[PDB]
Amino acid sequence: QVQLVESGGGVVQPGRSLRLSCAASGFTFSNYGMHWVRQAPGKGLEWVAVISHDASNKYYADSVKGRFTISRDNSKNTQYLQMNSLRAEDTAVYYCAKGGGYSYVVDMGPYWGQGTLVTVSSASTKGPSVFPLAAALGCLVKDYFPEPVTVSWNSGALTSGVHTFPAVLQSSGLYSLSSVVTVPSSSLGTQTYICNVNHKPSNTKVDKRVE
Amino acid sequence: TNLCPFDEVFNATRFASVYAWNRKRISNCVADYSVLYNFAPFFAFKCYGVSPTKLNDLCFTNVYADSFVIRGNEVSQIAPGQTGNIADYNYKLPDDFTGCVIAWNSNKLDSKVGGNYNYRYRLFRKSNLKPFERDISTEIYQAGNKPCNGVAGVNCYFPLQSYGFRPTYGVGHQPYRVVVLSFELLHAPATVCGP
Amino acid sequence: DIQMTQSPSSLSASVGDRVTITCRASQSISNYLNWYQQKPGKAPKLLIYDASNLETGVPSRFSGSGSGADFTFTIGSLQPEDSATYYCQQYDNLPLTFGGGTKVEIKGTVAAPSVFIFPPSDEQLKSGTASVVCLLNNFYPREAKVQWKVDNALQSGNSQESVTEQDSKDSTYSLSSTLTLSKADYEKHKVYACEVTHQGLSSPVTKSFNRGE
Amino acid sequence: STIEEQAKTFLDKFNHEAEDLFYQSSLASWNYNTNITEENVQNMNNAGDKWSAFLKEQSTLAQMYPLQEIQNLTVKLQLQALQQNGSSVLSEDKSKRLNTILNTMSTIYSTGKVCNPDNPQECLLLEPGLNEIMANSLDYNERLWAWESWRSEVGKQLRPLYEEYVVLKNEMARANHYEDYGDYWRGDYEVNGVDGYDYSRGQLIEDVEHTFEEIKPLYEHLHAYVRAKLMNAYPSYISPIGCLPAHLLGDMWGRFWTNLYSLTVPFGQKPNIDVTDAMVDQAWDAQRIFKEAEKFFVSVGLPNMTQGFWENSMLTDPGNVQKAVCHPTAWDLGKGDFRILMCTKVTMDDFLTAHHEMGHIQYDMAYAAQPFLLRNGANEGFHEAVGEIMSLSAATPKHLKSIGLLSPDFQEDNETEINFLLKQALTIVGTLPFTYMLEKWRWMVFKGEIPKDQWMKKWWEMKREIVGVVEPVPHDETYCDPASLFHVSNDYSFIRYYTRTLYQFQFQEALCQAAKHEGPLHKCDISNSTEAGQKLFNMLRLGKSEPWTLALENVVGAKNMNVRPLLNYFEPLFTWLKDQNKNSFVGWSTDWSPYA
Ligand SMILES: *[C@@H]1O[C@H](CO)[C@@H](O[C@@H]2O[C@H](CO)[C@@H](O)[C@H](O)[C@H]2NC(C)=O)[C@H](O)[C@H]1NC(C)=O
Ligand SMILES: *[C@@H]1O[C@H](CO)[C@@H](O)[C@H](O)[C@H]1NC(C)=O
Ligand SMILES: *[C@@H]1O[C@H](CO)[C@@H](O)[C@H](O)[C@H]1NC(C)=O
Ligand SMILES: *[C@@H]1O[C@H](CO)[C@@H](O)[C@H](O)[C@H]1NC(C)=O
Ligand SMILES: *[C@@H]1O[C@H](CO)[C@@H](O)[C@H](O)[C@H]1NC(C)=O
Ligand SMILES: *[C@@H]1O[C@H](CO)[C@@H](O)[C@H](O)[C@H]1NC(C)=O
Ligand SMILES: *[C@@H]1O[C@H](CO)[C@@H](O)[C@H](O)[C@H]1NC(C)=O
Ligand SMILES: [Zn+2]
Secondary structure, eight states: OOEEEEEEOOEETTTEEEEEEEEEEOHHHHHGEEEEEEEEEEEEEEEEEEOOOOOEEEEEEETTTTEEEEETTTTTEEEEEEEEEEOOOOOEEEEEEEEEEETTTTTOOSSBBOEEEEEEOOOOOOOOOOEEEEEEHHHHHHEEEOOOEEEEEEETOOOSSEOOOOOETTTTTEEEEEEEOOOOOOSSSSSEEEEEEETTTEEEEEEEEOO | OOOOOOHHHHSSOOOOOOOSSSSEEESSSSSSGGGGOSOOOOSEEEESSOOOOOGSSSEEEEEEEEEEEEEGGGGGGGGGTTOSHHHIIOOOOTTTTEEEEEEEEOOTSSOOOOBBTTTTEEEESSSOOTTTTTOOOOOOOOOOOSSTTTOOOOTOOOOEEEOBBTSSSTTTTTTEEEEEEEEEESSSSOOOOOO | OOOEEEEEEEEEOOOOOEEEEOOSSSSSSSSSSEEEEOOTTSSSEEEETTEEEOOTTTTTTTTTEEOSEEEEEOOOSSTTOOSSSEEEEEOOSSSSSOOOOEEEEEOOOOOOOOOOOOOOOOOHHHTTTTEEEEEEESSSSSEEEEOBBTTTOOOOSSSEEEEEOOOTTTTTEEEEEEEEEHHHHHHOOOOOEEEEEEETTTOOOOEEEEETT | HHHHHHHHHHHHHHHHHHHHHHHHHHHHHHHHSOOOHHHHHHHHHHHHHHHHHHHHHHHHHHTEEEEEEEEOSHHHHHHHHHHHHGGSOHHHHHHHHHHHHHHHHHHHHHHHOOTTTTTTTEEEEEEIIHHHHHSSSHHHHHHHHHHHHIIIIIIGSSHHHHHEEEEEHHHHHTTTTTHHHHHHHGGGGOBBBSSTSOBBBTTHHHHHHHHHHHHHHHHHHHHHHHHHHHHHTTTTTTOTHHHHHHHHSSSSSOOOOGGGGGGGOOOOSSSOOOOOOHHHTTTTOOOHHHHHHHHHHHTTTOOOOTTTHHHSSBBBBOOOOOOOOOEEEEEEETTTTTEOOOOSSHHHHHOOOHHHHHHHHHHHHHHTTTOOGGSSSTTTTSSSHHHHHHHHHHHHHHHHHTSSSSTTOOOOOHHHHHHHHHHHHHHHHGGGGHHHHOOOOOOOOHHHOTTTTSSHOOOOOOTTEEEEEEEEEOTTTTOOOOGSSHHHHTTTTHHHHHHHHHHHHHHHHHHHHTTTOOOTTTOOOOOOOOOHHHHHHHHHTTTTSSSSHHHHHHHOSSSOOOOHHHHHHHHHHHHHHHTTTTTSSSSSSSSOOTTT
């Protein structure tokens, strides 16, 4: 039942600070030690930092030397990372990984978090506009900058024939995506279809009916 | 039934050095502790926490076998709360360590005439090691107040030294193979179990 | 530091084949390498640990092999549910170094696209914008030709395309495209169309509509 | 970082490589002493050269830690031995000259021959030769011939080589912040540092004279007894009130008086104790004797000998197949390796030599845990004393009764006791004035108290006054009498024998008192007494890590050398000698001479 949950990610302007947290449940967090790894959008994994069990040996990557700080909270079952002087290419998804017990700082493997996503850009937030498209039907979401939106069909009831297309960058400085669901050709319009669009960065929840 | 491969741990051709000590993870198998009682000459078979008699009826998630070779007189340094060159710069066990230690003589395999220099330990270091810490650094140790500039000389030394095992040595200076079994069970479903 | 290279960077195999991956190293790392599987948008999952050992809850078709510097990963009877990216990682020393990665595409028989063009919603005109949506569905190859014929005239430079991920159930692909204009520009034209050219189609399929209907 | 931490790191590194290098050299030497081949000689020389080069290089780096800032009382001792310069201060030409002089003296002494007059086809050596002749002849002319020939051929050949020796070693010592070479030798007994246990170099002279002043009566009475018995063999050559001629002494330097036993037996009808016949009857071999030695050493609580001792040690001459040196030796090769080199035989003498070397191995085994530079005896005269106290207890008749090599109904009388005591005194009591004279003369020569042109005068003005022997024919300054000895021609010290002879009886007295023994002291077995082994082990494990003063205090209870236990060992013989010398004259005159 070991679970790792990452939090603290979002949007920050270049040259500022930001703290990320990893909360762990299901093991004695006080004497294991932890790792931070990150993955750039469309690139591979990249190891960032490691900390021992007590909190006395800390090791960093050269590319993040002098700006990142790793800390433990043995008691609260949380491990913290502090990021300073953020630059352009620090946008990534961050995972926290369980290590080997005591001061064995070269162990990792079969326990990862779900990851938290961090961007560094000078742009500002925006609100996603939702429109319907009515075989197959779907919803078009347009003009939302910061970070990705979740799309669900009838509160998750519909699971077959659902295609969630990846977002694309509108040159105006935004993102656009379209989601589709397929209904059998034999049966015409008989049930009400509603798509739910959730945007955590701007806290925008929209329900759009397609008919 | 897939019996756990303790054979490839105990019966290995060569072991690891003290400063670079070998770690092997074993899981997803049934473990029998009767086979481990082979190789009748045992210098020491001492367990802390659980008892060897009650070891058979236990369950864990994973087992970790740490293997290396040391000098005989150094065996007593592989216990919790021990001090020495091995216990301060080479291999460290925590105070609350729970596990088994098996040390047996290896004079017939790890001793050569003229010197078996493949086994090395660390002699100098700036500080001590924390439990379960492995250091393989090869930086020049400075014993004075003048930069060494990356070259040995006056008050500048090389940290790692080598054993010279030979068959004609005494029992205390003979090589001894040491394996440490550490049992790790988590709140996840247990995996390592016996018959 | 430690540098490790994955090869091949991309591999394609049929349903009943065998796949082998290689991972190198710049020094001796002994049995200190592990392999991860990553589906799109998910955290990596450990498959092989400690240089060819199997874990719990994994099919027996996954098997590793290697020692020293060069290591190999192998899959047995391939299945539709094996589309992901595979990574190799060392844990011998300081900063742990991953690999480039290997993307596996499952190649199957050619299918026929299902095209349904969505006319722009009135809200687009209410906001002064426009968007014509051309939808391809269930076709094996990565991409096909999508061309507009607004008023029997081709348009370019004002449209965007999107390609989904390969399905683990039937090994298919889908594509969508959106065309953005203004309300005045949309009202200037009268007829809109989308033309799709695909390998599995005898002739390109044109779906068209008009402003008046 | 302070100086002390750098010194400790240097010493750790030094010890780690020194152990390996010394073990390699010691194993090479063991191979050269077991086998004999030019390849073994080359390997031994290579190991020795590597060890010496390492020692010189480590000594060179030692001077850049000043010695006046280290306060640890065991780090300073090692760095003191490392910082000693020796012959390195002298120039290259001076060092080469000194080495050539020493090698010349050694070669001349080791290759001295005496050819009989008017016959070039007959020449005799020392060993054998002059030694056997003067140890087993009763002819006045033959002993005189050998004694004069040794100092005429060999003796006159070393005086010019010894002339420059003094003035060169003097400058070597002066450049080392000393006064002469005599102080360089005396520095072994200096103890600076710990308070209350201080010993100075000058204190050695006063201590030696004070101990010698208490030996004079017993030596004079033994002198009178030997003089009285020697007039029955040389009726017209010895004066009742004069001195003993220097050539009627059994030994050609007069060092030992053992060979006179047959001429001085108190009671010749009653034989001595010999168990060789009983041993050969009982089917005893080398293994059986060595197992008895091990059992005896176990009985006092001392540990066994290791499994490698019983396999690597040579306890018998292999024969014509091999060629090994049959000189009893104890080897501590380092890293837990201990061996005995001895070509033992079924005999009482080898039975006792086995115990001697066994005790040497025990003493070496005790201090294996000390650092490399402190793995020796506290001074130069402890290790042999410990060796010989063990052989003291093995020749007691009760010990031979307890083993089965003696008839169980053997009653010991009061005449064989006198025979044994006289046999011991002729070897032990008769060698001390000789040593005292030799060292005193060397000290005065080095210091400058004896002018260059008044050497031999003094050398025979003191023999008549200290030793009690006069020259048969006078000599001029063309002779070099002291150089006729091995320890003078070869650069060696001689006070160690005096010191060891005085310490061994203190050790035996302490062990016997701790053993709750009642009876004559010369009959004392420390067997089956754990208290007599623990007290010894309390000192055996110290090594050089502590001053010899405290090492001696831990055993005998006194911090200074004493002679009373030696006197208490020969009290029955003292009383018998005084009884037998009621009709003779005790003392001697410094005027009588055979050439007068
Ligand atoms: C030291 O003590 C042992 C133990 O008693 C003695 O060994 C026995 O001595 C008695 C004495 O009459 C013999 O009858 C036994 O046969 C001995 N047992 C053996 C040799 O196993 C030993 O003699 C004592 N040593 C002495 C007195 O010097
Ligand atoms: C170890 O290996 C040797 C040789 O392969 C074999 O004879 C022995 O039985 C093995 N020991 C065990 C406990 O299997
Ligand atoms: C050493 O002696 C043994 C005994 O005979 C012999 O076999 C061996 O060849 C000798 N070694 C050398 C180098 O002569
Ligand atoms: C001298 O140093 C040694 C080094 O271990 C130490 O054991 C000893 O106690 C020190 N002596 C004193 C008097 O501090
Ligand atoms: C030994 O000689 C050197 C000169 O070569 C000198 O610097 C050093 O002080 C001497 N050692 C001692 C202990 O005086
Ligand atoms: C010494 O060895 C003998 C036989 O090898 C044994 O009987 C005896 O108990 C040993 N002594 C000690 C003190 O272990
Ligand atoms: C030995 O004992 C006898 C018996 O009384 C005695 O006459 C004699 O003086 C003693 N001493 C010697 C040396 O015989
Ligand atoms: Zn000896």
